[PDB]
Structure 1
Amino acid sequence: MVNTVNYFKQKLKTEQQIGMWVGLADGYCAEIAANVGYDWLLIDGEHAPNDVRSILAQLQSIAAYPSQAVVRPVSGDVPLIKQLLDIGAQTLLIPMVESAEQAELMVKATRYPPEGIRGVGAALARASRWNNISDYLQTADEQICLLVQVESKKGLDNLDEILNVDGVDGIFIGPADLSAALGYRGNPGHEFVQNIIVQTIQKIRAAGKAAGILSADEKLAKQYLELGTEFVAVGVDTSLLMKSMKQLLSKFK
């Protein structure tokens, strides 16, 4: 078997990828999302009740479908990153990255020694298909994609330094965390926050990195796509389930 090609990583340079957030924390729900045709699915290990074992079930569900899986760990924890790579997550989204030093550690966390610090256990890993990918330890690094989130004042204070880190493939803006950090908690739509988001996207792309964001607001998501943003998540499974059920009940009250 040849290593699974990371099409998400390649497409950061060739197209704009439409994403769906997956926080229903279940292999069955992840498969429903996988049937829709999103370019990427974000399995959320930060804000949904997921662990390594439930994330594995969802990677297994999604794997039969063309949608590319991206996993968000609860934090930039090196041993947790090791665990998510070995169950076969090829793209990671690291929340709350705030310095070039932290970004560089996340780069090393995703790469094998001697250049990085990813723990080596290919005999046990779904990532290598238990060494059925015979050259995995030589071909693994090439298909791993590292995305970091800028979503705090400290992240914005270190943006230019993070953008000079080789191995950071993309910077994703978190509007909820960022609007809260800016003293506009629950009000990311305010011009003060949106002007910072637009300037941040423009700086990310000017440094030759992919820019990403999540917005469930169709107008904002379309504006971000018009600006060239490479990976845009346009909704959240929990939100869509709740709103679809509420909108239906409202027709009958």
Structure 2
Amino acid sequence: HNKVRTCWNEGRPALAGWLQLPGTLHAEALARLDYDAVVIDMQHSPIDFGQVAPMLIAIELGGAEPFVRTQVNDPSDIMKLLDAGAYGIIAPMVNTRAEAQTLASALHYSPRGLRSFGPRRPSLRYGSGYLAQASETVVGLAMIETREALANIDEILSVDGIDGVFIGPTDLALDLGHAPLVDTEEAEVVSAIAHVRERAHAAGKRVGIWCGSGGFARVKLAEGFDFVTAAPDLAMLSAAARQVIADARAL
């Protein structure tokens, strides 16, 4: 019933949207497109809890799995989102095994984790048998965005209770001393990205990546990424508007 986990169990990757603009209308509209999930970015956006909550509902209604890229790897924040019906969590700046364990701790009820019990919205979706299936209903990915996370990749990938990792390639490029360019060709960054993917797959884990274009996303899917996001709502909208203006003004 988690649409991303269904993709994976059926041998296919998932393609997901990425929202930095608050509100329910575009969230539902994009969810109804051929995205398997839609990620709401609570880090690099003005989207707070009050605004994310109805967006989760709208995405679920539209027929994509609602995901959140959180502001921080904080257990209580993550738990509140889970209980509000976030069914995927992408936690930024997971740099060590212990930080990955902190992420895992939030995603599972005791004995596997320490998630606090009060599943307001998942109990409506899944019913009274939710507890037994709860861990499978949520996808959890630790972000790999720093030199330190790269160095600790195998120790992060060893953590039970996380599905895998999600590469933040602009932050990773910046931490490597390069420009935080979307969809970069910088050879060292491209190499590090491929390394993380290879390590994740060798560990039997999933790997995702953030993309700024459909063409780059196609390549990432071909390279074997399990979870590919493309492209941020604001960037797509701004580019579309610039083109409309150029067309109208005959430029």
Please name the residue that 2:113 is paired with.
Answer: 116
Give the Cα–Cα distance (whole angstroms) in 2 for the partners of residues 135 and 181 of structure 1. Answer: 44
Please name the residue that 1:31 is paired with.
Answer: 28
Structure 1 runs of 4+ with >6 Å offset? none
Listed as ranges, the gaps of 5+ residues in structure 2 are none
Contact 1:21 1:44 in 2 (8 A): yes
TM alignment of 1:142-221, pairs within 5 A = 142-187=136-181, 188-221=184-217
Give the Cα–Cα distance (whole angstroms) in 2 for the partners of residues 110 and 88 of structure 1. Answer: 13
Query: Amino acid of the residue matched to residue 7 of structure 1?
Result: K
> 1:50 aligned to 2:47?
yes
Any idea what SS the aligned residue of 2:196 has? helix
Please name the residue that 2:246 is paired with.
Answer: 250
Please name the residue that 2:226 is paired with.
Answer: 230
Any idea what SS the aligned residue of 1:129 has? helix
Listed as ranges, the gaps of 5+ residues in structure 1 are none
> 1:129 aligned to 2:108?
no
Give the Cα–Cα distance (whole angstroms) in 1 for the partners of residues 187 and 17 of structure 2. Answer: 25
Give the Cα–Cα distance (whole angstroms) in 1 for the partners of residues 219 and 31 of structure 2. Answer: 25
Give the Cα–Cα distance (whole angstroms) in 1 for the partners of residues 73 and 172 of structure 2. Answer: 17
Query: Amino acid of the residue matched to residue 222 of structure 2?
Result: E
TM-score (normalised: structure 2): 0.92
Work out the percentage of aligned pairs sharing the same amino acid.
Answer: 32
1:24-76 residue CA offsets vs partner (Å, 9 max, x unmatched): 11112211211222111111111121122211101111122221211111000
Give the Cα–Cα distance (whole angstroms) in 2 for the partners of residues 218 and 135 of structure 1. Answer: 39
TM-score (normalised: structure 1): 0.91
Give the Cα–Cα distance (whole angstroms) in 2 for the partners of residues 168 and 110 of structure 1. Answer: 8
Contact 2:108 2:161 in 1 (8 A): no
> 1:62 aligned to 2:56?
no
Give the Cα–Cα distance (whole angstroms) in 2 for the partners of residues 78 and 184 of structure 1. Answer: 32
Tell which has more relative contact order, 1 or 2 (C-alpha 8 A, sep 6+): 1
